[PDB]
């Protein structure tokens, strides 16, 4: 009866055995069948402007309602197992950003979405291991989540990319010239105005908390209003 939540999640994960490549291929085939069936249903939804009933959906596949429903179930369970047995991969990738703005548990749950998408777009016919395709999606989901959920004043992804390129250019100039580059040099190298560079530098800052010891910061800030004297 531990109180830790991450350890409990890791235990819940460890109760699942890793898949094998043949198991991956089988599950990928069932997942593809489920995806095609879902696409058909979506077509029925466009035709009916409503959710099709199981009987209408079974009729759309010329399949007995029992056979159709069992096929649907198998596909659901296949996708479920594919995601479930790879959560360990999700944790292995998510542990590499535990100090960037999102807590470890948030990284895990955001990488789970990438794993789900990877399991939805895996192609067995490609002839590759699922652990190679899934890594890209897990990493992308975690990086996007960090870009969109790490700051109180959220910055767009293009701003993160701009800041990264500014850092790389600054390091390259420092290595080339053997000294710290100036603002004008960096602005010329980046082909952008110095005011834009200063704006990027100002927007990259982290907001300081009101309760920073100085005694707290929040007790030294005046209030917006009209002074009784000025009325």
């Amino acid at each position: 009866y531990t109180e830790d939540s991450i350890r409990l999640y890791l235990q819940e994960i460890g109760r699942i055995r890793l898949l094998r490549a043949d198991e991956e291929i089988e599950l990928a085939r069932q997942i593809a069948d489920l995806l095609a069936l879902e696409r058909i249903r979506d077509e029925l939804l466009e035709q009916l402007d409503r959710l099709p009933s199981d009987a209408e959906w079974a009729a759309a596949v010329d399949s007995p309602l029992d056979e159709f429903r069992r096929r649907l179930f198998r596909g659901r369970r296949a996708k479920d197992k594919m995601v479930q047995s790879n959560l360990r991969l999700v944790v292995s990738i998510a542990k590499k950003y535990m100090n960037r703005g999102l807590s470890f548990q948030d990284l895990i749950q955001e990488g789970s979405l990438g794993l789900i998408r990877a399991a939805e777009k895996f192609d067995h016919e490609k002839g590759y291991k699922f652990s190679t395709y899934a890594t890209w999606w897990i990493r992308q989901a975690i990086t996007r989540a960090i870009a969109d959920q790490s700051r109180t004043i959220r910055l767009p992804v293009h701003l993160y990319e701009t800041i990264s390129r500014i850092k790389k250019t600054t390091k390259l100039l420092s290595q080339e010239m053997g000294r710290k580059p100036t603002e004008e040099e960096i602005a010329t190298r980046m082909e952008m105005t110095i005011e834009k560079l200063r704006f990027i530098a100002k927007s990259a800052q982290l907001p300081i908390s009101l309760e920073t010891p100085i005694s707290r910061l929040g007790d030294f800030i005046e209030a917006d209003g009209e002074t009784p004297e000025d009325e």
């Binding site: 043949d22 291929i25 016919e125």
Partner: protein, 485 residues
């Protein structure tokens, strides 16, 4: 007195300054050869080591890719690689060196057959370490290249039983390395195992010949495999189902002959005083069992010749350090050596109030000497700082931890009349300030040592009153120093 120290004197022995009071004897537990450490700026060896030796080889330290590997050149010209680094302790049975051999290294995987070769049957857990051969013989090696994958069917490029050349992309991103027939294994539209086996192929026209080769067979050189077909060298003939039906495959069988005993010269221990001799036994191990069907794209090592540390029974728990001895005749030439070093630690002499006497340790042996088990190695003697009389050493069943020396300045003489002082006895307890005789008052307290005509000997003493119910931290006739409760 230190733990295990034994006094050399009895109660009452009048000793002089510097004389031995107590001694600690260090003895060798098992005996052997003495090794004295070099005088590293100290004229007193703080440690002495107990040691058999083997030398009759040559050793050179060569640097390859920044790694210092030791090559053991035997007097017969054979070469070994030293798998164990200097300073490492290994027990009995551990591999020390590996024969640098390439003859028994295959190019690819395949199948293994035994011919008269026999092995020891002790232990399955040693399978990773191989199988020790109990009798030499002939190994038959049937080559094959096995690509083990778990990939889907539609990636396949080659037909079951197609005769191929090496380099063909049999499966997407998989390249064959051997020119032969490809046999394909699939499970529910999933490619599992692909096999390429070299050897000549030939048409099977007569079903009876195929029935003879239903299970595969060996055929010697010159022996006619079937009418019109004679094997020029020993080959494995097996019936395989190719694209058009039955075919006969003649895979080239390799023969590797292993001698009954590894012909690598052992090096003999040179010291008889070690009743538990230590030696290097050369062993031959086959890493795979009879008929073990091996699947490997790259070559494997079949036979390994390993030097193994061996010792007499009862010494199985001994661990031997590994050292290099520079040869006396040629210092450049180094020789590998295994020692069962046993340490004996000598404490530095301390004369400053630890025992309150000078502790001096003298060795009882010389470097290179041969000692029996239990022989005394070192004697540490405690020398008294001040002459006097030794007391406080009680007898029986307890280790002497503290002794007492009553010195010249712990006795005082006083001029008192014997005639009327007859009320006192040697060993009386005199409280100072007490009227000993009419008009005579005790100047200082003490114990009555002697009563001479007109004189009195007092050993200085001081009392402490104790009331009923107190707790006693000490014992009668004990020994206490300054500050003790």
């Amino acid at each position: 007195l230190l733990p295990g120290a034994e006094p050399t004197v009895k109660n009452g022995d009048r000793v002089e300054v510097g004389d031995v009071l107590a001694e600690t004897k260090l003895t060798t537990e098992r005996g052997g050869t003495v090794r004295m450490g070099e005088d590293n700026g100290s004229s007193t060896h703080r440690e002495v080591e107990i040691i058999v030796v083997l030398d009759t080889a040559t050793v050179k330290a060569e640097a390859s890719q920044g790694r210092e590997h030791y090559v053991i050149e035997t007097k017969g010209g054979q070469r070994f690689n030293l798998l164990a680094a200097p300073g490492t302790k290994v027990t009995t049975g551990h591999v020390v060196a590996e024969l640098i051999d390439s003859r028994y290294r295959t190019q690819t995987g395949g199948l293994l057959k035994y011919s008269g070769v026999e092995i020891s049957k002790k232990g399955r857990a040693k399978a990773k370490q191989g199988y020790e051969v109990t009798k030499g013989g002939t190994l038959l090696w049937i080559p094959e290249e096995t690509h083990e994958v778990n990939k889907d069917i539609s990636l396949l490029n080659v037909e079951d039983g197609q005769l191929v050349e090496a380099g063909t992309e049999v499966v997407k991103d998989i390249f064959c390395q051997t020119t032969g027939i490809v046999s394909v294994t699939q499970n529910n539209d999933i490619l599992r195992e692909i096999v390429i086996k070299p050897g000549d192929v030939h048409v099977l026209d007569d079903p009876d010949t195929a029935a003879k080769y239903d299970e595969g067979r060996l055929v010697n050189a010159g022996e006619e495999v079937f009418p019109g077909l004679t094997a020029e060298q020993l080959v494995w003939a097996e019936a395989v189902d190719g694209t058009d039906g039955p075919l006969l495959l003649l895979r080239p069988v390799q023969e590797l002959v292993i001698p009954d005993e590894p012909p690598v010269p052992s090096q003999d221990s040179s010291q008889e005083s070690s009743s538990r001799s230590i030696r290097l036994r050369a062993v031959q191990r086959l890493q795979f069992q009879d008929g073990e069907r091996i699947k490997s794209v790259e070559g494997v090592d079949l036979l390994r010749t390993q030097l193994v540390l061996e010792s007499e029974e009862g010494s199985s728990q001994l661990s031997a350090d590994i050292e290099l001895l520079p040869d006396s005749k040629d210092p450049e030439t180094l020789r590998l050596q295994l020692v069962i070093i046993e340490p004996v630690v000598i404490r530095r002499d301390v004369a400053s109030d630890t025992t309150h006497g000078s502790t001096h340790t003298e060795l009882r042996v010389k470097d290179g000497q041969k000692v029996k088990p239990g022989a005394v190695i070192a004697c540490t003697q405690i020398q008294c700082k001040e002459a006097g009389v030794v007391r406080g050493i009680q007898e029986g069943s307890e280790a002497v931890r503290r002794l007492l020396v009553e010195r010249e300045r712990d006795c005082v003489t006083l001029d008192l009349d014997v005639t009327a002082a007859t009320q006192l006895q040697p060993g009386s307890l005199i409280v100072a300030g007490t009227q000993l005789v009419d008009g005579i008052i005790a100047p200082e307290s003490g114990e009555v040592r002697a009563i001479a005509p007109g004189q009195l000997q007092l050993r200085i003493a001081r009392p402490y009153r104790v009331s009923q119910g107190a707790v006693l931290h000490v014992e009668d006739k004990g020994l206490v120093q300054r500050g003790d409760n």
